[PDB]
Amino acid sequence: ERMILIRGLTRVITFDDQERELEDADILIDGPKIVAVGKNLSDRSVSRTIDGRGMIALPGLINSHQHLYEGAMRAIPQLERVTMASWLEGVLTRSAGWWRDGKFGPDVIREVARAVLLESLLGGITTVADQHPFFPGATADSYIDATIEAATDLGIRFHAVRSSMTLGKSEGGFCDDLFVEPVDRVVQHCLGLIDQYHEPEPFGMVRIALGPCGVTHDKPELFEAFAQMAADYDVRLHTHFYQPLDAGMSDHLYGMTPWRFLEKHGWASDRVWLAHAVVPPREEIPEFADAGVAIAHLIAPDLRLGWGLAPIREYLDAGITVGFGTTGSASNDGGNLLGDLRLAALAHRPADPNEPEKWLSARELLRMATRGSAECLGRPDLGVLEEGRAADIACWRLDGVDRVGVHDPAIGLIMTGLSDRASLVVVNGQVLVENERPVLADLERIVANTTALIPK
Ligand SMILES: [Zn+2]
């Protein structure tokens, strides 16, 4: 009261239940929450007014699938053109080698996370779900502590997804037994993280989720423990889903499809969101919907790894929640969620060359990146510019020379531009970016410090 007023925004995209948009309108903020969205709001109890003229405001973008530690693994010549098998082997080899050489402990990961998460804020991303699977040694080291610390320092909203690779090469697994933890170690560790960090209240800034790498990378016992843990502590469940080699490997290991696996081990529920979902059998999609599972579309790695086009239109037709994410920077290789939406806008269209009404629109993509992702993460308090939701807001300027001649500013955010840099970004009511610059973080100092720590 002590309120913040963003006045005169040229366009507001709400993604509320009526899909309202507004022009020349205001957003009124008090503490962590939005008070009003509308024309000519009162500045009676306002301590600060921000000039929104020439900007478009959206809900803060929500990256429902990251791997922050991979920020250290960008643009590696040997991984430029690689199929999954070679790629995965190259990432595991590097994370294991750097770690054993003392170059990749929680303290390095903290600063790599700080850089990728600051990038995220600067890209208009106000919540990130990071899935960290790398816990070498005889004790679960403090990598998630490190990412939470970075996220907390920056003030970005954060879901830490505790991942693993519990299926050993012995038992038909992919990875070296250095990455393989006993299921009880993983379960024990997750219990402690929930107790220490999880903020279940509305507008909570740190949440914990439980996330096996996959149906063919983790023991079915882990899936069931997590299903129990999620019901008892009311947290959510995350895993990869229907990557191209999965159906065959699942059949080989278990004689069932990946979806049947999930059903059998307690994961066919509305506690679950699923990464990629590139190549499910079409017949199972109605079952996804009936179960209430959510799907995060990840166009950039699906393309980069040569996997192709997830049936997103089919998911939307079926009423399935669709969110959006970047995955990690070893398979993207950036954290630029907004830019990746352009990739999706365009790459999907050749699959349906004569039915353009099937193509994903700009507004559908922006909805996936905000409300959709919010729903993946089970956050009814995010992803929507309306009274009562979190004051998580991302705004871009529309008056650049590269956006001249744009007729619809929302389509324009996808279809035009030299830069995806946000102008104004608010998280939990706190202004963190203004004039395309961090207001509390030392951008240059963060770059210098993290750069020095990247393994060479
Ligand atoms: Zn992933």
Short mmCIF file of C-alpha atoms and ligand atoms in Angstrom, two decimals:
data_model
loop_
_atom_site.label_atom_id
_atom_site.label_comp_id
_atom_site.label_asym_id
_atom_site.label_seq_id
_atom_site.Cartn_x
_atom_site.Cartn_y
_atom_site.Cartn_z
CA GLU A 1 0.00 0.00 0.00
CA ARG A 2 2.93 0.54 -1.11
CA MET A 3 1.15 -0.67 -4.30
CA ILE A 4 2.77 -0.64 -7.76
CA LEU A 5 0.89 0.62 -10.83
CA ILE A 6 1.86 -0.18 -14.39
CA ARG A 7 -0.05 2.44 -16.35
CA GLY A 8 -0.95 2.71 -19.98
CA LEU A 9 0.22 -0.62 -21.31
CA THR A 10 -0.49 -0.65 -25.00
CA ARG A 11 -1.66 -4.25 -24.97
CA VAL A 12 -2.44 -6.64 -22.11
CA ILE A 13 -2.88 -10.36 -22.81
CA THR A 14 -4.60 -11.90 -19.75
CA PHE A 15 -5.28 -15.55 -20.59
CA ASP A 16 -8.16 -15.32 -18.14
CA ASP A 17 -11.21 -17.53 -18.63
CA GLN A 18 -12.60 -15.14 -21.23
CA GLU A 19 -9.22 -14.66 -22.94
CA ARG A 20 -9.60 -10.92 -22.35
CA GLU A 21 -7.12 -8.59 -23.94
CA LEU A 22 -6.93 -4.88 -23.21
CA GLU A 23 -5.32 -1.91 -24.84
CA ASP A 24 -4.21 1.25 -23.12
CA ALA A 25 -4.77 -0.40 -19.73
CA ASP A 26 -3.26 -0.82 -16.29
CA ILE A 27 -2.07 -3.48 -13.86
CA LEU A 28 -2.29 -2.77 -10.17
CA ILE A 29 -0.05 -4.69 -7.80
CA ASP A 30 -0.02 -5.02 -4.01
CA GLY A 31 2.62 -7.19 -2.36
CA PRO A 32 2.79 -10.52 -4.21
CA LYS A 33 -0.56 -10.27 -5.95
CA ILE A 34 -2.44 -8.58 -8.74
CA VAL A 35 -5.20 -6.26 -7.50
CA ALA A 36 -6.76 -5.23 -10.77
CA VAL A 37 -6.36 -5.31 -14.50
CA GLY A 38 -8.24 -2.61 -16.38
CA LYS A 39 -8.48 0.89 -17.80
CA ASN A 40 -7.69 3.94 -15.67
CA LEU A 41 -7.05 2.26 -12.34
CA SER A 42 -6.74 4.40 -9.23
CA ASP A 43 -3.30 5.34 -7.99
CA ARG A 44 -4.73 6.23 -4.58
CA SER A 45 -2.59 3.86 -2.48
CA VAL A 46 0.23 3.63 -5.03
CA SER A 47 3.81 4.30 -3.96
CA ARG A 48 5.15 3.82 -7.50
CA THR A 49 3.79 4.19 -11.03
CA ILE A 50 5.54 2.58 -13.98
CA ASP A 51 4.97 3.85 -17.49
CA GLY A 52 3.78 0.95 -19.63
CA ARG A 53 3.18 2.87 -22.81
CA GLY A 54 4.60 1.16 -25.89
CA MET A 55 4.71 -2.27 -24.22
CA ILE A 56 2.79 -5.53 -24.34
CA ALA A 57 2.21 -7.27 -20.96
CA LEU A 58 1.70 -11.01 -20.55
CA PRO A 59 1.66 -13.30 -17.59
CA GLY A 60 5.27 -14.13 -16.70
CA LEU A 61 6.52 -16.95 -18.92
CA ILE A 62 6.91 -20.32 -17.19
CA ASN A 63 9.62 -22.72 -18.27
CA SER A 64 8.21 -26.06 -17.21
CA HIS A 65 11.32 -28.05 -18.09
CA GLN A 66 14.94 -27.01 -17.47
CA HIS A 67 18.32 -28.64 -16.73
CA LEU A 68 20.28 -25.69 -15.41
CA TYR A 69 23.63 -27.43 -14.93
CA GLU A 70 23.73 -28.01 -18.70
CA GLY A 71 24.29 -24.26 -19.20
CA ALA A 72 27.93 -25.24 -18.91
CA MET A 73 27.59 -27.52 -22.00
CA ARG A 74 26.50 -25.19 -24.79
CA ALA A 75 27.67 -25.33 -28.40
CA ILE A 76 30.16 -28.16 -27.99
CA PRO A 77 31.41 -29.05 -31.48
CA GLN A 78 31.35 -32.82 -30.72
CA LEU A 79 27.69 -32.65 -29.75
CA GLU A 80 26.50 -30.34 -32.53
CA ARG A 81 25.08 -32.99 -34.82
CA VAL A 82 24.35 -36.03 -32.63
CA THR A 83 21.58 -38.48 -32.16
CA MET A 84 20.30 -39.12 -28.67
CA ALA A 85 22.57 -42.06 -27.89
CA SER A 86 25.74 -40.16 -28.78
CA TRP A 87 24.39 -36.99 -27.19
CA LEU A 88 23.42 -38.62 -23.91
CA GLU A 89 26.74 -40.40 -23.76
CA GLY A 90 28.60 -37.14 -24.36
CA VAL A 91 26.69 -35.28 -21.63
CA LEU A 92 27.13 -38.10 -19.10
CA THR A 93 30.82 -38.42 -19.91
CA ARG A 94 31.39 -34.70 -19.41
CA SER A 95 29.34 -34.32 -16.23
CA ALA A 96 31.17 -37.35 -14.76
CA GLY A 97 34.63 -36.23 -15.87
CA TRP A 98 34.28 -32.63 -14.74
CA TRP A 99 32.85 -33.79 -11.44
CA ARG A 100 35.57 -36.26 -10.61
CA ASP A 101 38.18 -33.60 -11.53
CA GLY A 102 36.65 -31.27 -9.00
CA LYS A 103 35.26 -28.85 -11.59
CA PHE A 104 31.53 -29.55 -11.24
CA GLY A 105 30.46 -29.51 -7.61
CA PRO A 106 27.37 -27.80 -6.16
CA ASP A 107 29.28 -24.49 -6.04
CA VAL A 108 29.86 -24.47 -9.81
CA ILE A 109 26.31 -25.58 -10.45
CA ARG A 110 25.15 -22.67 -8.27
CA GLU A 111 26.82 -20.14 -10.52
CA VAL A 112 25.79 -21.86 -13.78
CA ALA A 113 22.25 -21.84 -12.39
CA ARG A 114 22.57 -18.15 -11.49
CA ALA A 115 23.53 -17.31 -15.05
CA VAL A 116 20.84 -19.38 -16.79
CA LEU A 117 18.19 -18.19 -14.32
CA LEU A 118 19.20 -14.54 -14.88
CA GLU A 119 19.00 -15.18 -18.61
CA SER A 120 15.51 -16.51 -17.95
CA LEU A 121 14.38 -13.34 -16.17
CA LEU A 122 15.81 -11.27 -19.03
CA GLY A 123 13.78 -13.45 -21.45
CA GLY A 124 10.60 -12.70 -19.56
CA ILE A 125 10.58 -16.01 -17.66
CA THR A 126 9.31 -15.64 -14.08
CA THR A 127 9.09 -19.31 -13.05
CA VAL A 128 11.48 -22.15 -13.87
CA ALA A 129 11.15 -25.87 -13.10
CA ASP A 130 14.66 -27.36 -12.98
CA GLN A 131 15.14 -31.13 -13.16
CA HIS A 132 18.53 -32.04 -11.81
CA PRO A 133 19.48 -35.73 -12.15
CA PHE A 134 23.18 -35.73 -11.30
CA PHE A 135 24.09 -36.97 -7.80
CA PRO A 136 27.44 -38.78 -8.00
CA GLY A 137 29.19 -40.19 -4.96
CA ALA A 138 28.11 -42.08 -1.87
CA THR A 139 26.05 -39.16 -0.55
CA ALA A 140 23.42 -37.10 -2.35
CA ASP A 141 25.33 -33.84 -2.78
CA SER A 142 23.73 -30.41 -2.45
CA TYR A 143 23.06 -29.55 -6.11
CA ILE A 144 19.39 -28.72 -5.53
CA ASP A 145 20.41 -26.64 -2.49
CA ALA A 146 22.67 -24.74 -4.87
CA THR A 147 20.01 -24.15 -7.51
CA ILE A 148 17.48 -23.03 -4.89
CA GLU A 149 20.13 -20.66 -3.52
CA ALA A 150 20.74 -19.06 -6.92
CA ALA A 151 17.01 -18.84 -7.64
CA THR A 152 16.38 -17.29 -4.22
CA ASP A 153 19.22 -14.79 -4.63
CA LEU A 154 17.69 -13.65 -7.92
CA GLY A 155 14.06 -13.68 -6.76
CA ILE A 156 12.87 -15.92 -9.61
CA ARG A 157 10.08 -18.34 -8.76
CA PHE A 158 11.41 -21.90 -8.64
CA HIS A 159 10.37 -25.56 -8.75
CA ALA A 160 13.22 -27.98 -8.08
CA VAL A 161 12.52 -31.42 -9.54
CA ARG A 162 14.70 -34.03 -7.85
CA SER A 163 15.75 -36.42 -10.59
CA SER A 164 17.78 -39.59 -10.79
CA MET A 165 18.88 -42.52 -12.86
CA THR A 166 18.16 -45.49 -10.65
CA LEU A 167 18.10 -48.23 -13.29
CA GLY A 168 21.61 -49.60 -13.58
CA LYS A 169 23.28 -50.81 -16.79
CA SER A 170 23.19 -54.13 -14.92
CA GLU A 171 19.38 -54.11 -14.85
CA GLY A 172 19.07 -52.92 -18.46
CA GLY A 173 19.86 -49.27 -17.80
CA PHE A 174 21.59 -46.65 -19.95
CA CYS A 175 24.10 -45.08 -17.61
CA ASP A 176 27.33 -45.78 -15.76
CA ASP A 177 26.75 -47.09 -12.22
CA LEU A 178 28.34 -43.85 -10.97
CA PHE A 179 25.05 -42.04 -11.66
CA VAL A 180 22.96 -44.80 -10.10
CA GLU A 181 21.62 -44.34 -6.60
CA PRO A 182 19.67 -46.90 -4.57
CA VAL A 183 15.98 -46.05 -4.65
CA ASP A 184 15.86 -45.56 -0.86
CA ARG A 185 18.64 -42.95 -1.04
CA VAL A 186 16.62 -40.96 -3.59
CA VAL A 187 13.41 -41.30 -1.54
CA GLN A 188 15.17 -40.33 1.71
CA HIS A 189 16.76 -37.33 0.04
CA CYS A 190 13.49 -36.09 -1.45
CA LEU A 191 11.80 -36.30 1.92
CA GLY A 192 14.39 -34.00 3.38
CA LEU A 193 14.15 -31.53 0.51
CA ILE A 194 10.40 -31.27 0.86
CA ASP A 195 10.69 -30.67 4.60
CA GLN A 196 13.44 -28.05 4.18
CA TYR A 197 12.31 -26.14 1.10
CA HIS A 198 8.75 -26.76 -0.06
CA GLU A 199 6.47 -23.69 0.16
CA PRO A 200 2.95 -25.07 -0.47
CA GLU A 201 1.05 -21.88 0.32
CA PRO A 202 -0.30 -19.69 -2.50
CA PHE A 203 2.43 -17.53 -4.03
CA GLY A 204 5.09 -19.90 -2.68
CA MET A 205 8.46 -19.12 -4.24
CA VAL A 206 10.15 -22.53 -3.86
CA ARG A 207 8.48 -25.91 -4.48
CA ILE A 208 9.81 -29.44 -4.73
CA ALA A 209 8.67 -32.02 -7.26
CA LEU A 210 9.67 -35.61 -7.82
CA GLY A 211 11.08 -36.52 -11.16
CA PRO A 212 12.62 -39.80 -12.33
CA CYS A 213 14.53 -39.43 -15.59
CA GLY A 214 12.28 -41.96 -17.27
CA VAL A 215 10.39 -45.23 -17.59
CA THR A 216 13.52 -46.85 -18.98
CA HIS A 217 16.03 -45.07 -16.72
CA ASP A 218 14.51 -45.62 -13.29
CA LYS A 219 13.18 -48.49 -11.25
CA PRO A 220 9.42 -49.04 -11.10
CA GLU A 221 9.86 -49.08 -7.30
CA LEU A 222 10.96 -45.44 -7.47
CA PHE A 223 7.84 -44.49 -9.42
CA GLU A 224 5.62 -46.10 -6.74
CA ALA A 225 7.49 -44.52 -3.81
CA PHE A 226 7.13 -41.13 -5.46
CA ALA A 227 3.41 -41.77 -6.08
CA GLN A 228 3.09 -42.44 -2.32
CA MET A 229 5.24 -39.46 -1.40
CA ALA A 230 3.32 -37.13 -3.69
CA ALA A 231 -0.01 -38.13 -2.17
CA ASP A 232 1.24 -37.84 1.40
CA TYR A 233 3.01 -34.47 0.98
CA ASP A 234 0.87 -33.13 -1.87
CA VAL A 235 3.70 -32.45 -4.33
CA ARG A 236 3.80 -33.12 -8.07
CA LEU A 237 5.34 -35.76 -10.33
CA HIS A 238 7.40 -35.28 -13.48
CA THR A 239 9.15 -37.45 -16.04
CA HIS A 240 10.09 -37.74 -19.69
CA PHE A 241 7.51 -39.35 -21.93
CA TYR A 242 7.46 -41.02 -25.35
CA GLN A 243 10.86 -40.05 -26.63
CA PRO A 244 11.37 -42.08 -29.83
CA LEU A 245 13.35 -45.01 -28.34
CA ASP A 246 11.10 -45.45 -25.29
CA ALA A 247 8.25 -47.63 -26.60
CA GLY A 248 10.67 -50.30 -27.77
CA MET A 249 12.87 -50.20 -24.69
CA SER A 250 9.81 -50.30 -22.41
CA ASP A 251 8.46 -53.28 -24.31
CA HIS A 252 11.84 -54.95 -24.04
CA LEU A 253 12.20 -54.34 -20.27
CA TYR A 254 8.59 -54.81 -19.17
CA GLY A 255 6.37 -55.93 -22.06
CA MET A 256 4.31 -52.78 -21.89
CA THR A 257 4.06 -49.29 -23.31
CA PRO A 258 5.45 -46.33 -21.36
CA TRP A 259 1.93 -45.18 -20.56
CA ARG A 260 0.89 -48.57 -19.22
CA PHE A 261 4.01 -48.50 -17.11
CA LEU A 262 2.96 -45.17 -15.64
CA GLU A 263 -0.60 -46.40 -15.08
CA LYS A 264 0.65 -49.50 -13.34
CA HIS A 265 3.01 -47.65 -11.02
CA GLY A 266 0.64 -44.87 -9.91
CA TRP A 267 1.43 -42.06 -12.36
CA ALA A 268 -1.80 -41.93 -14.37
CA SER A 269 -3.08 -38.99 -12.32
CA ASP A 270 -3.59 -35.25 -12.19
CA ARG A 271 -0.39 -34.93 -10.14
CA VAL A 272 1.74 -35.58 -13.23
CA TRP A 273 3.21 -33.52 -16.04
CA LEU A 274 5.11 -35.17 -18.82
CA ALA A 275 8.04 -33.88 -20.89
CA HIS A 276 8.17 -34.06 -24.75
CA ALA A 277 5.42 -36.64 -25.49
CA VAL A 278 6.72 -36.78 -29.06
CA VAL A 279 5.43 -40.15 -30.28
CA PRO A 280 2.67 -41.71 -28.19
CA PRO A 281 0.32 -44.23 -29.82
CA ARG A 282 -2.69 -42.18 -30.89
CA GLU A 283 -5.09 -44.52 -29.12
CA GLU A 284 -3.60 -43.64 -25.72
CA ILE A 285 -4.18 -39.88 -25.98
CA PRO A 286 -7.82 -40.03 -24.76
CA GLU A 287 -6.45 -41.97 -21.81
CA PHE A 288 -3.94 -39.16 -21.06
CA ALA A 289 -6.88 -36.73 -21.01
CA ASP A 290 -9.09 -38.95 -18.82
CA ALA A 291 -6.22 -39.37 -16.36
CA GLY A 292 -5.64 -35.62 -16.21
CA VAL A 293 -1.90 -35.72 -16.90
CA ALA A 294 -0.31 -32.58 -18.35
CA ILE A 295 2.25 -32.36 -21.19
CA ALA A 296 5.11 -29.87 -21.62
CA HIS A 297 5.90 -29.21 -25.28
CA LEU A 298 9.67 -28.90 -25.85
CA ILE A 299 10.07 -28.02 -29.54
CA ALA A 300 13.76 -27.13 -29.49
CA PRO A 301 15.21 -30.45 -28.34
CA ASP A 302 12.56 -32.42 -30.26
CA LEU A 303 13.99 -30.79 -33.38
CA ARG A 304 17.64 -30.66 -32.33
CA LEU A 305 17.73 -34.39 -31.65
CA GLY A 306 15.83 -35.17 -34.85
CA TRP A 307 12.81 -36.58 -33.01
CA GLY A 308 10.26 -34.42 -34.85
CA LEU A 309 6.85 -32.95 -34.09
CA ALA A 310 4.82 -33.83 -31.03
CA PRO A 311 1.06 -34.09 -31.76
CA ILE A 312 0.22 -30.92 -29.89
CA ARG A 313 -2.95 -30.14 -31.81
CA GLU A 314 -4.24 -33.57 -30.91
CA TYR A 315 -3.48 -32.93 -27.25
CA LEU A 316 -5.34 -29.62 -27.34
CA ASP A 317 -8.29 -31.26 -29.15
CA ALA A 318 -8.39 -33.86 -26.31
CA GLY A 319 -8.51 -31.24 -23.57
CA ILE A 320 -5.06 -32.17 -22.27
CA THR A 321 -3.10 -29.40 -20.52
CA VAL A 322 -0.17 -28.33 -22.75
CA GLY A 323 2.71 -26.29 -21.34
CA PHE A 324 6.06 -25.25 -22.82
CA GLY A 325 9.74 -25.49 -21.95
CA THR A 326 13.28 -25.31 -23.33
CA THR A 327 14.90 -28.33 -21.65
CA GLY A 328 18.57 -27.90 -20.82
CA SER A 329 21.15 -25.93 -22.70
CA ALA A 330 22.99 -29.08 -23.84
CA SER A 331 20.00 -29.71 -26.15
CA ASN A 332 18.70 -26.32 -27.15
CA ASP A 333 21.22 -24.67 -26.55
CA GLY A 334 19.70 -21.61 -24.89
CA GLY A 335 17.05 -20.88 -22.28
CA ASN A 336 15.12 -18.58 -24.58
CA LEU A 337 11.58 -19.76 -24.15
CA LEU A 338 9.97 -16.94 -26.12
CA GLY A 339 12.26 -17.52 -29.08
CA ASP A 340 11.52 -21.23 -29.03
CA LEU A 341 7.83 -20.42 -29.46
CA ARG A 342 8.65 -19.12 -32.95
CA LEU A 343 10.27 -22.46 -33.72
CA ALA A 344 7.03 -24.19 -32.83
CA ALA A 345 4.84 -21.69 -34.66
CA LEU A 346 6.67 -22.47 -37.85
CA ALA A 347 8.00 -26.05 -37.59
CA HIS A 348 4.57 -27.61 -37.01
CA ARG A 349 3.00 -26.29 -40.20
CA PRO A 350 4.51 -28.61 -42.92
CA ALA A 351 2.93 -31.62 -41.16
CA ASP A 352 -0.54 -30.31 -42.09
CA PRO A 353 0.18 -28.44 -45.33
CA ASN A 354 -3.47 -28.14 -46.38
CA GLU A 355 -5.16 -27.63 -42.99
CA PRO A 356 -3.87 -24.35 -41.56
CA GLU A 357 -6.54 -24.32 -38.89
CA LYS A 358 -4.56 -27.18 -37.28
CA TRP A 359 -1.37 -25.09 -37.03
CA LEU A 360 -0.65 -23.67 -33.60
CA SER A 361 -1.44 -19.99 -33.39
CA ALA A 362 0.63 -17.33 -31.68
CA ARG A 363 -1.95 -17.01 -28.89
CA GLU A 364 -2.09 -20.76 -28.33
CA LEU A 365 1.70 -20.84 -28.00
CA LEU A 366 1.78 -17.87 -25.65
CA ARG A 367 -0.92 -19.61 -23.59
CA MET A 368 1.21 -22.79 -23.43
CA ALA A 369 4.17 -20.70 -22.23
CA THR A 370 2.12 -19.07 -19.42
CA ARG A 371 -1.16 -20.63 -18.24
CA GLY A 372 -0.34 -24.04 -19.72
CA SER A 373 2.99 -24.27 -17.98
CA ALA A 374 1.41 -22.97 -14.77
CA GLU A 375 -1.10 -25.82 -14.92
CA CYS A 376 1.69 -28.32 -15.65
CA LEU A 377 3.32 -27.19 -12.42
CA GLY A 378 -0.04 -27.22 -10.62
CA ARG A 379 -0.01 -23.47 -10.02
CA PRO A 380 -3.51 -21.97 -10.14
CA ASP A 381 -1.87 -18.77 -8.73
CA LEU A 382 0.25 -18.17 -11.86
CA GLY A 383 0.04 -17.77 -15.64
CA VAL A 384 -2.91 -15.37 -15.72
CA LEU A 385 -3.23 -11.59 -15.45
CA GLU A 386 -6.25 -11.28 -13.20
CA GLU A 387 -7.21 -10.12 -9.73
CA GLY A 388 -6.03 -12.57 -7.09
CA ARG A 389 -3.20 -14.22 -9.06
CA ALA A 390 0.53 -13.66 -8.51
CA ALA A 391 2.07 -10.44 -9.66
CA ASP A 392 4.32 -12.29 -12.12
CA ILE A 393 4.41 -10.06 -15.21
CA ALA A 394 6.53 -9.88 -18.34
CA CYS A 395 6.44 -6.96 -20.74
CA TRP A 396 8.12 -6.24 -24.09
CA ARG A 397 8.44 -2.96 -26.04
CA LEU A 398 6.52 -2.71 -29.32
CA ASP A 399 8.12 0.48 -30.61
CA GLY A 400 11.43 -0.97 -31.87
CA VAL A 401 12.33 -0.46 -35.52
CA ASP A 402 12.20 -4.25 -35.99
CA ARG A 403 8.47 -4.31 -35.00
CA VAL A 404 7.31 -1.48 -37.24
CA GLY A 405 4.38 -2.48 -39.40
CA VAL A 406 3.08 -5.08 -36.95
CA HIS A 407 -0.74 -5.25 -36.93
CA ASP A 408 -1.29 -7.59 -33.98
CA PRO A 409 1.24 -7.19 -31.14
CA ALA A 410 0.74 -10.73 -29.77
CA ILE A 411 1.37 -12.37 -33.13
CA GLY A 412 4.19 -9.85 -33.53
CA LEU A 413 5.95 -11.14 -30.39
CA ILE A 414 6.27 -14.52 -32.15
CA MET A 415 6.65 -13.55 -35.78
CA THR A 416 8.97 -10.50 -35.67
CA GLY A 417 11.99 -9.10 -33.93
CA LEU A 418 15.74 -9.02 -33.57
CA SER A 419 15.54 -9.58 -29.82
CA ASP A 420 13.46 -11.53 -27.31
CA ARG A 421 14.74 -9.42 -24.39
CA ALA A 422 11.93 -8.38 -22.10
CA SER A 423 11.67 -4.74 -21.05
CA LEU A 424 9.94 -5.02 -17.70
CA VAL A 425 9.71 -8.12 -15.52
CA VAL A 426 7.97 -8.49 -12.18
CA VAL A 427 8.14 -11.61 -9.97
CA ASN A 428 6.04 -11.89 -6.86
CA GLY A 429 5.36 -8.18 -7.10
CA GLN A 430 9.07 -7.36 -7.18
CA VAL A 431 10.47 -5.48 -10.15
CA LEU A 432 13.52 -7.45 -11.30
CA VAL A 433 14.08 -6.20 -14.85
CA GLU A 434 13.57 -2.69 -16.20
CA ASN A 435 14.90 -1.19 -19.42
CA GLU A 436 16.07 -4.66 -20.36
CA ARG A 437 18.39 -4.59 -17.34
CA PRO A 438 18.34 -6.43 -14.01
CA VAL A 439 17.45 -4.01 -11.24
CA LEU A 440 18.94 -5.95 -8.28
CA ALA A 441 21.41 -8.40 -9.87
CA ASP A 442 24.86 -7.35 -11.09
CA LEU A 443 24.64 -8.63 -14.64
CA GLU A 444 28.28 -8.09 -15.64
CA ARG A 445 29.66 -9.41 -12.38
CA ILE A 446 27.51 -12.57 -12.65
CA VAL A 447 28.76 -13.14 -16.20
CA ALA A 448 32.39 -12.76 -15.18
CA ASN A 449 32.15 -15.05 -12.16
CA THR A 450 30.23 -17.85 -13.86
CA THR A 451 32.35 -17.67 -16.99
CA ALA A 452 35.48 -18.25 -14.89
CA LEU A 453 33.95 -21.45 -13.54
CA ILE A 454 32.89 -23.06 -16.81
CA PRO A 455 35.05 -26.13 -17.34
CA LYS A 456 37.59 -25.62 -20.15
ZN ZN B 1 14.75 -33.22 -19.95
#
